[PDB]
Design an enzyme around this catalytic site. Structure first.
Site, PDB file in Angstrom:
ATOM      1  N   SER A 169      42.416  52.109  40.747  1.00  0.00           N
ATOM      2  CA  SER A 169      43.477  51.224  40.339  1.00  0.00           C
ATOM      3  C   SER A 169      44.555  52.057  39.855  1.00  0.00           C
ATOM      4  CB  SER A 169      42.651  50.377  39.382  1.00  0.00           C
ATOM      5  OG  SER A 169      43.940  49.724  38.497  1.00  0.00           O
ATOM      6  N   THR A 210      45.396  71.059  46.265  1.00  0.00           N
ATOM      7  CA  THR A 210      45.727  70.290  47.548  1.00  0.00           C
ATOM      8  C   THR A 210      44.382  69.773  48.179  1.00  0.00           C
ATOM      9  OG1 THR A 210      46.163  72.564  48.757  1.00  0.00           O
ATOM     10  CG2 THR A 210      48.073  70.793  48.085  1.00  0.00           C
ATOM     11  N   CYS A 241      37.479  28.751  29.671  1.00  0.00           N
ATOM     12  CA  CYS A 241      36.107  28.691  30.475  1.00  0.00           C
ATOM     13  C   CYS A 241      35.030  28.629  29.460  1.00  0.00           C
ATOM     14  CB  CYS A 241      36.283  30.091  31.201  1.00  0.00           C
ATOM     15  SG  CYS A 241      34.957  29.819  32.758  1.00  0.00           S
ATOM     16  N   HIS A 281      41.159  28.138  34.627  1.00  0.00           N
ATOM     17  CA  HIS A 281      41.884  29.414  34.277  1.00  0.00           C
ATOM     18  C   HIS A 281      43.304  29.279  34.697  1.00  0.00           C
ATOM     19  CE1 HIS A 281      37.924  31.704  34.197  1.00  0.00           C
ATOM     20  NE2 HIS A 281      37.744  30.377  34.784  1.00  0.00           N
ATOM     21  N   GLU A 314      45.690  31.297  33.847  1.00  0.00           N
ATOM     22  CA  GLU A 314      46.345  32.447  33.828  1.00  0.00           C
ATOM     23  C   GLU A 314      46.445  32.872  35.191  1.00  0.00           C
ATOM     24  OE1 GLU A 314      43.735  31.464  32.530  1.00  0.00           O
ATOM     25  OE2 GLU A 314      42.124  32.809  32.557  1.00  0.00           O
TER      26      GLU A 314
END
Lengths: 533, 533
Positions: B13, B189, B385, B510, B512
């Site tokens: 991520s 590298t 929720c 939800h 959002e």
């Protein structure tokens, strides 16, 4: 805990993959040591029971009703053991299991991947085949080309099995096709150096090597590949062309390959006597042959070597047992489909006829004519599966006189569904019938050929069929002279015969799957005796 | 006819895979072009619905009820489209489908394999995403590590995808983590060279590189990876740390990546205005901020960045809109379970409290205390929720005085199952209830905050839950002050509120998941407006 011999390479059937594992198995077994074989197929089919025998080969059936790779058949014949559903592992099954367990939250919110979740299923399935077959030693035959995508999860799996269990319990035997250049005499290393790398790349180091070639490997060659493969010349062993697969075990002990192997695990035992296998083998080569019989075999895919490997091997066991040399005349069922071109010279020569398993309607008249010919000219005949069903059809349209008799499989519309799908109890249905699979019970009628052949009232053969004899037609068939000599516990017809003929037998089941070199199928025994006169 | 941009690399991520793809997307769409993005997850889970949002991150929900990789959330936020179940392709779903089709004899007796049956399935799915979305260009984001097993079939499929339609319709953007060694200044590298190596072995030639690094790439270091990877320098481009991912499009427009891309694909358009987006970015960075507001977020997993990514973005979108600077106070809910260790200080500073989704029972009390606190001190509160369900409880055992009130999920034995599973109408049941998923109608009550926030009676929010408000208790909950401002088509309580407070709203859905840079969740708008007074 257990020991493990992992085998790779093959990449073909000309290469002897399956028989080498089976041979190796057999040699271990005779040494007190408990053993079991496991074949991995890295294809996606959950099992082999939807696969076309063309391009792929025969579908073997275990006592427990699994439809598998023919390699288990090699195992059964060589080690004289009953295989189970667990001895054949497919990527198909593994993926199915892992996906099902995930969907059931059995993985507790983890992200399920090849490694380790798939690799762990593989090891659980390998190890499980070991414990349920009570084995101290376990061969794992790994299909496909090493280094193909499909193979990776299984290679990685066994690489891990080696880190866990140790080098004193896990070994690799690789099978490479040596093949000296087309016009030079020097061997083509390219495939062979291409392999060893892919194994190292995946992290596997071969311990023993089997080079497959027409002729044994010279001293030189073997020292050469010894290098590319990084293996000790002491541990390279030869697989050369040979007249029958059953020799393989004998050339392996002349090279002692299994001795080398056993040490390399840190076990000890010897004094195997093959004399009993040795004589069986010499009986297979035609040595002290009392005659030569021709058997015509009628179906399709007849040009494929392994399309009917079990029927063929069962013919060998029966013959070798009673000392007679089988010659096989394969006949495409279409080459009989001619009210023109006659046949009383095509099968005038053969001393026995077999109509092959396998369905559809491709050549169903060709097959039906061959049957009519066997019955009418009193040529000994054996009907198997679709063959057995075409006997019902042939007998009904010719002896009984129902010009329109047929299987609903061929024409769902016939006036006389003499063969049809049935339901669990009613019994006629165009639903989807009840598929019978595996060892099932067959009740023999006393006085008949069937009872005599088996020498007892109750026996078992493995099944793989869904189309049955219509019960409504049974009795008028008997009245026309046909004998039901075999029925299932719930009354389905299993074996028919015609006592009027020297030898005319058909069966829904597949007795060839139970044939062993030292233990021929009884059905195939009677047929081969009758044939040989 | 369809163009394809295949994006590989970004093993995680922080490397920015998801957003890069999402940014390129949005920049294309702003030009003439119809565009979509597709995420491939080479894992065996069929979808993301069984996964623990720890370790892996928040599960996204599509309008259509798919439970998916969070990357689709980036696609929605950046390109402002609704994604579909087809835009998240999993190795689990491919294998499930292929296997099922095999068991159905859809493959007509063939031996089914990775190649070509699996790679065909993947191609079909990629192609299907294209057309059902109606794209001329399709971003295909391939997760995982190039050269790993789980990835091969997808890499193989994208290779085939190319050699099919042409070098002018299929390109390869590879993201490499550029990272100069610890103490010498020159770059390691090792992984980079190892990757461009894993790609040629697979037969994939990258067309553009994106070097992810802290700082932009200098003239020297980019030139170098240009060699290692055999790519024209003009096609190597920098991805460096920015304050907000919403900056990424901008830095790509400066470097004109999408312009270089559009050519290599032989397409022509331009004049894109980001002025509207630049402004939105400045608000996000706090330029001209009217004030700072502190929001407490109470739940578990608060230490992982992306466990509640959409809740944050929604907060950012609404804050930026009304021109305010949010500071998030993450609070593990266990840090509040304490009959000691008071809190008019831990939460004394915040002007906003949100209790987080995510059920179980780990820190249920901490979340409850938090809800007691905001209701009692009149801190604007948003519950979501399992948050909403806890609000309902807190309300019960406190204001309504039902000390045993609870969800059946936390204690199926409770005296007052104020929250529980309910069967398809009846409705009380401990079976397995009815899972609510994706866009779902909610009828708003007039004169409520909820009605006011939406400015209309009929609205939709994406759902992902099973445990509902027990209908029995509704009527007394109402009389004790609770207001149901939202119910389902069939009268399940969707949204509640306490008019006694300046802002205390909890919803099952939800909201959002629908929030955009330009189009904030009406629920988050309200909350943030209330928070900032």
């Amino acid at each position: 805990p257990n020991k493990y011999i992992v085998v790779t390479g093959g990449v073909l059937s000309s290469v002897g993959k399956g028989t080498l594992v089976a041979s190796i198995g057999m040699l271990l077994k005779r040494r007190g040591y408990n053993v079991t074989a496991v074949k991995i197929d890295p294809y996606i089919n959950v099992d082999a029971g939807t696969m076309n025998p063309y391009m792929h080969g025969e579908v073997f059936v275990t006592e427990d009703g699994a439809e598998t790779d023919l390699d288990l058949g090699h195992y059964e014949r060589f080690m004289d053991v009953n295989m189970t559903k667990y001895n054949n592992i497919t990527a198909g099954k593994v993926y199915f299991e892992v996906i099902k367990k995930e969907r059931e939250g059995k993985y507790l919110g983890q992200t399920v991947q090849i490694i380790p979740h798939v690799t762990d299923q593989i090891k659980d399935m390998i190890r499980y085949a070991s414990k349920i077959n009570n084995a101290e030693i376990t061969l794992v035959e790994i299909g496909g080309t090493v280094g193909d995508i499909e193979s990776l999860p299984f290679l990685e799996a066994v690489r891990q099995l080696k880190l866990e269990e140790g080098e004193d319990n896990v070994i690799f035997v690789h099978i490479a096709l040596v093949e000296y250049l087309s016009v030079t005499g020097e061997l083509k290393t390219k495939p062979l150096q291409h392999s060893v790398q892919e194994l190292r790349r995946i992290g596997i180091q071969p311990d023993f090597i089997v080079g497959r070639a027409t002729l044994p490997l010279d001293d030189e060659t073997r020292r050469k590949i010894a290098l590319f493969t990084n293996v000790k010349v002491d541990h390279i062993v030869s697989s050369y062309d040979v007249e029958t697969s059953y020799e393989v075990p004998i050339i392996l002990e002349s090279q002692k390959l299994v001795s080398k192997i056993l040490s390399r695990l840190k076990l000890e035992d010897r004094q195997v006597d093959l004399t009993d296998w040795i004589s069986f083998v010499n009986n297979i080569k035609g040595i002290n042959s009392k005659k030569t019989i021709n058997i015509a075999l009628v179906g399709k895919y007849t040009k494929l070597k392994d399309s009917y490997i079990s029927i063929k091997e069962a013919i060998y066991h029966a013959s070798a047992y009673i000392g007679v040399r089988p010659k096989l005349i394969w006949i495409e069922s279409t080459d009989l489909e001619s009210d023109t071109k006659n046949l009383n010279e095509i099968l005038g020569n053969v001393n026995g006829i077999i109509v092959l398993p396998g369905f559809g309607s491709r050549g169903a008249e060709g097959k039906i004519k061959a049957i009519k010919y066997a019955r009418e000219h009193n040529i000994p005949f054996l009907g198997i599966c679709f063959g057995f069903q075409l006997s019902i059809v042939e007998f009904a349209r010719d002896v009984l006189g129902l010009s329109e008799a047929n299987s609903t499989e061929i024409n769902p519309n016939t006036k006389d569904p003499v063969i049809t799908l049935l339901d669990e109890q009613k019994n006629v249905t165009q639903l989807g019938g009840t598929m019978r699979l595996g060892a099932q019970k067959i009740i023999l009628k006393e006085g008949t050929i069937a009872y005599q052949l088996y020498g007892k009232k109750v026996v078992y053969e493995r099944h793989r069929h869904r189309y049955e004899v219509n019960p409504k037609y049974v009795d008028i068939l008997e009245d026309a002279g046909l004998v039901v000599s075999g029925i299932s516990e719930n009354g389905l017809v299993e074996i028919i015969e015609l006592p009027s003929n020297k030898f005319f037998v058909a069966t829904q089941a597949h007795p060839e799957f139970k044939s062993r070199p030292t233990n021929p199928s009884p059905i195939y025994l009677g047929f081969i005796r009758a044939v040989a006169s």
